[PDB]
Design a protein around this ligand. Structure first.
Ligand SMILES: O=P(O)(O)OC[C@H]1O[C@@H](O)[C@H](O)[C@@H](O)[C@@H]1O
Lengths: 338, 337, 337, 338, 338, 340
């Protein structure tokens, strides 16, 4: 009954290291992995961005963990929705019961490389909704055709399909899209934020599901949190500043194109700016209470990203002192196929 | 030192089965895998098309085999060249010395799903050449920008990079592109064909490499062949007809959009149409001689696709009776960093 | 009252020869001509493709035959619908009561030359339906404007107009478009196919007409058939293989771009593949029964394409032994204003 | 040896009437026909615009006259250059030695119907030059490919071909294009204008041919003139005003879209505006002198458009009183295939 | 209470001269200015085309006159509608109660320079209607987004705004657009035309306003007239021919691209062609009666363009002999913010 | 030693155009000789709260003062403004106010250009657009009928009939070394923002090199700098004014991709006084203002445009007029942005 999610930070860590650490996380009581889908890190100092789809095959073949993208933008910049659909179907077919397809509206940091018009957030939401339609049609396993405002799909069929499709999870912090997620998709993924914002997103998601005749109590509500654990408070604070200054950027970041841009913006970030966004302490009891609070709000899964380079030590510390003491409701839905 | 390539047919086989069979192939003396990059099978009866990039991670993590795409079209339909570059760099970074990036001009069967203008072959070659430029720029590990006829890349850098890039291998049967492959890339992959055509492609590749100041003797020349082994000749023939009628289609196939189109065309295919394209026999000595002949022509790697559903039996038969008796030149270059 | 249509194969025959043969066909009891609108032949061995619109003027001025395009794609590749409308209006104005405008969704073989995105069949049907709208608006003889998904027409008027427009005939083998043809157009043209498929197309056409308040009994139902007559059965078979291998290609052909593509595919075609698609016999009684059967199914016009180069001999043989013995219903509607 | 060209005005006359009149013109000593390629007449009162390509087949099959388009715009509005090439090849294949392909930059009056950007004249000239390239490639009878600024041609071949291609004649009044015509094409077609302008165009054409190593003395120099003959001078003048007011519009007309536009502009036209553009007289001796002058300038063919509805009477009058008295140089090149 | 509008002809006059003449016009009893928004003059002989938006700032800062564009095409060739909105808001904010935004469907003469597809009039009307929507949204002073057939506006707000927006006046001679003007906008501007045409436009405008629940009696109905005053009738006639031949072109002019085109067309214009379009006389009593007649038809403002170069003399003559004797209804609505 | 002078920077982001007009008139009385006017559609932040249409305002400035003035800067690269229209506007202003207008142009910011809903290129690509726009403007400035077809712009037969005898100078506003060089090569003068000595020297050097390689004499070409200051009655008020009014001054990072005032507003919450060093001088001490400006002259800038960030514009103008402008020492020969 004990469990917790590990957040695999492709922005920071070589994929070989992430693979080994996920294997260790499994040994230490973590039950699932959230894997970023980036082309670029936020900053050069972070220094990585593996191709997540290849890595997920390695994870799948060497562990029994559940895993998902957190998140892929299937809106036709880096990735056409038909390709995301095929990738998701292949992973679930190879590792049945284990994959969840996390999708979102994307950031310029990754999508700008293809040199196309970058729509405002509200327009990208419309793109995401159409992409969901494409993915769901392909997941039926029939020959489908699609023509909408944003995507054209000629006769296409997924021949390699699991018995049951992986759930589609939307990663968003927008009330509007949270409602739509409940209506159109299988579950919600959101970032750490204050109680008021989390409650609003949960409520919107529930309302959307209910208006579509669905039972939201059986739908995953997932949160991705950023923490900094280290041997001292001082090191935890320093790790957050050095490794994750984007965590202290409480402003919309979806239009910023270059790691060098975030790098220059990072020079403004101070410890104060991380409050409510990154917990920075050596006290593992406080980590436990922070996570428990989120369960109590109604989150059914938590994916934890430790911002420090001390991943192995973090994993062992959480395995020993945090995960065993988390109290999950017994019936709580988890992101996996019916 | 004994070795052979296994061709993993995503058109036909569930990725889980391919994974298990590659693991077995490794045990049985195969040293490398060629993996098709399809969205659709040629026919419904073939019945599969896994996303190769995810599968390759599984292969990498559970074997020590070399492996490559055979081939990916990085020309902006299913895949933007920058993404292919990133995928290749990630695989090589995770499995250093093991990945080779096979690329080609693509087929409508897979690319048509995105609903865009499909250029004639010669134009797609020009697209492929520009894509090679994009991939090579990204492989430098610097922040690069690119603006050409076909692709626009804004400031982009591969942060996750091996110390040394994987080789770029072009899959082609065109004399022109074979020459360009020698000039611009690291090695050649071509399908089975008669001696005259293979010699021409090898010669063009060599000429291209030499004119660019490279030594072609150190560059891989790879061939992908289709065979049908079974317990009897009769079963081998039947397997080819049922599973791989596209093997008997000696005509350009790059414009045909649907599995149902090939399926209807398959009704015309007869055993005669496979001669020189698919060896169909139970006689493993004849398999051995066929493969040895290709080595003798100057191919440094062979990837074998058995068309039958009897993959496990084929792998064990080749491991016992074929692979140990193949004679490779000792210095032969292999597709690796 | 005795009659039959002659199919003028622009893919195979020099326009001067077609002109002379149509003149002969008229003398021999044929009453109408169906003229292909191609840019390319299916194969180099066929070896021709005259511009049909110019030829039709010559036909019109030297015979009293009815004639139509079988068929023109007015969907904006080779031809903008406004130009097809003008051409049709001019022909009917010059030869009143004689022209019928046959249109269809087109094939890549002809349309690919302009280098544009080639939509799937269902999308091309939507283009065809919009083109019909454009043609019909122009046929009103008023100044019209049009803005739809596929076509934009600025203020345009046909000043040169017959008193009554030529009928619009759709050439299709699709149930959906057959229904739409009944709804939106004046008549149906379909290729030879088995009885079940022909009955379905007729039924769909009738349903479409009835739902639009039209009487389908007064609307032409036309079929184009391919035959091979020669002095012996053996020559008839050889003629079909050599001249019309596309007749033995029972698969969708609308995406294939080049004569050389069909030429390579032709190497697979055998006599068996022509059954139900091309009647191959020297026995003129069997030709008669085959055609009579189609009349009995409810076709009101038949256009016969003899695949052999023996056009003159075919015309004389049909004139002597086939046409006089065909029994047409007395009331049967014919494609004319 | 006696001859003259008849100009078939599709803007004014039903194609059936034009066919009969061309047959008569042949009987009366005319040897060739120039056929306008319009979609619209200049004015509603003109009232026609047959599809020339169909009509030319009828002309070809019922006469022995030479004939040409005067002119077709093969620049991708109404007509793609590959289709013009095929049409020209078919006509010449059916009627060898008789067809000449007249081409030009086109007018909005006809091209605007397809609803596309209408370039300035100089840009349309660049389009015409590229179209010439396409037509010439196709006329080789090989499989050709083309990719330029304006046209894309995928693997294309003319299987139906004459032994020798029809000549390409450019219709232009521009000095620059006249030079290019000499360089790239087989002959020049120009409208009636004052002596100075005609001499300049001839000179430019000659220079272009010479710089390309060609002999301009063997290349056709063709002029299309508008006349008004009738039983009295007064009727001839009235006929010009009523039927051909565009003849009195000495200004660029290539951008004007609608017959109704020209119709409204026609209300301003007066007899004076036709001087040098339309000869208006009943005196057939003066018709003779006018035409002879153009021969003397160096034109090797003249195509005469009588603006009046009295086509039959005009044809018979010219046949009796004008054509027999015209003196052509014995060697003069005529627009027809080598 | 006495008043009249002065029409500032940017096609003809250097902006510095227009500025001085407007200052004089104010002294002489004119109360408002209509300023053309051109890039090109109709003819080279006219010889000018200042950027009106810059000039209007000079006018605003050195007079107390009302003023408006007559008219700007906000349909995305020279000008994006968002920019017109901003310009209008700035002028009204700087000169409250004084600016009116006159808009129209534009002419190729000015818009063709940007090298884009030029739609037929009816299509340009649809563009104008969408532009009106954009301008009105921006005039609310909120952050707005817009996506229609012709224009895309991302999050945009006018921070510099008057308390009350300037009125939107449509310049048109089309019955359809006149009705739409009443429905969607604040007032009508039309050119001089015969009584029947003016009555139809007024009636259409009124009907449109009434069907939208508005009171047309409180909405401006403005007319722009062209006159030629000079010391003699003969000079007045000559001035019209030389300076304003476009005034004698009673035909659609919206597709003609170049000053040189109009210049060549001008050679056809004769005095007769100006009847109802340009009053040509030295008799100032007849000027008075002509203007009074238009008031009597129901026009609430008249903008007078003297076609001659004798602007100063015209202004003084009108100030002395015409303006004091015009009788305006006391109630009459004038183009200015509520 | 030249006559006394200084440029006033008119901040359309912050101030109602009517206020700017009155303040420029006062600035003229107080010894300022030229105006730099921002060409924005949006302010950086809602708190700044304005964005008048500069082109209309410039007519009012021209007609009510004798000051020189320029756009600082207009992006003539076809988002808000087609280059042909900028050319016409510039020609009209110079024709109306000969000897007084300078056309300042640049690569633009998303903040203003994004409203038209188009692809926003990276800086280097926008530079290529700017270079083509310069070509278009210069062709139009010849006064002939011109045609243009390039990668970014198509101009059909177009002519400026309303033209000064001599065209206004084209000044490029840039902080990029590459474009600074191009400015020297292709244009008449350079405008750059306040920055450290190293960056300013690089831009000046690039500009000079570009001019020299094109056969021009850079000693006769304007080198202009726009600086942001905060003067107030106390240091404390000067600091507060900078934080409240001009937090973008403390954003030492590329800002050209950020679309919304609300985006900058949220980013502003991170800005602290430290972040303004070298970017905004914050002091009540007018002697220190004097030394700061003099230093820039000494580096080789021939014109300085001063933006006081505070709402105390009138007081700033009077203080500078009394205590700063009279004591600035300009080289006697120094070239100023104006037509030949
Ligand atoms: O809350 P923010 O700053 O928008 O971050 C959203 C998420 O963005 C994703 O790209 C990252 O992988 C996550 O680590 C991060 O939490």
């Amino acid at each position: 009954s004990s469990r917790l999610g590990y957040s695999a930070s492709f922005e920071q860590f070589h994929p070989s290291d992430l693979l080994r650490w996920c294997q260790l996380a499994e040994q230490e009581g973590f039950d699932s992995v959230l894997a970023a889908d980036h082309f670029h890190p936020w900053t050069p100092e972070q220094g990585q961005s593996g191709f997540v789809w290849a890595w997920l095959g390695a994870l799948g073949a060497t562990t029994r963990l559940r895993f998902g993208t957190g998140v892929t933008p299937p809106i036709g910049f880096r990735y056409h929705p038909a390709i995301v659909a095929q990738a998701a179907a292949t992973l679930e077919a190879m590792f049945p019961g284990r994959f969840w397809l996390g999708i979102g509206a994307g950031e310029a940091l990754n999508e700008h490389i293809v040199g196309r018009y970058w729509p405002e957030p509200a327009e990208r939401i419309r793109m995401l909704i159409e992409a969901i339609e494409v993915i769901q049609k392909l997941f039926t396993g029939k020959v489908i055709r699609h023509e909408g405002v944003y995507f054209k799909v000629e006769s296409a069929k997924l021949y390699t399909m699991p018995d049951v499709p992986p759930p589609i999870i939307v990663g968003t912090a927008g009330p509007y899209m949270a409602k739509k997620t409940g209506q159109l998709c299988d579950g919600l993924l959101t970032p750490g934020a204050n109680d008021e914002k989390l409650r609003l997103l949960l409520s919107r998601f529930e309302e959307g599901a209910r208006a579509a005749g669905k039972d939201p109590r059986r739908m995953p509500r997932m949160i991705q949190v950023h923490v900094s654990w280290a041997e001292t408070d001082e090191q935890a604070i320093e790790n957050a500043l050095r490794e994750w200054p984007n965590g202290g950027m409480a402003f919309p970041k979806g239009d910023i194109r270059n790691p060098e841009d975030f790098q220059a913006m990072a020079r403004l970030v101070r410890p104060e700016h991380f409050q409510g966004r990154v917990l920075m302490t050596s006290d593992l009891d406080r980590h436990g209470e922070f996570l428990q609070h989120l369960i109590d709000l109604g989150f059914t899964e938590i994916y934890v990203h430790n911002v420090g380079r001390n991943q192995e030590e973090f994993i062992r510390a959480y395995g020993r002192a945090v995960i065993p003491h988390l109290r999950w409701p017994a019936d709580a839905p988890v992101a996996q196929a019916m």
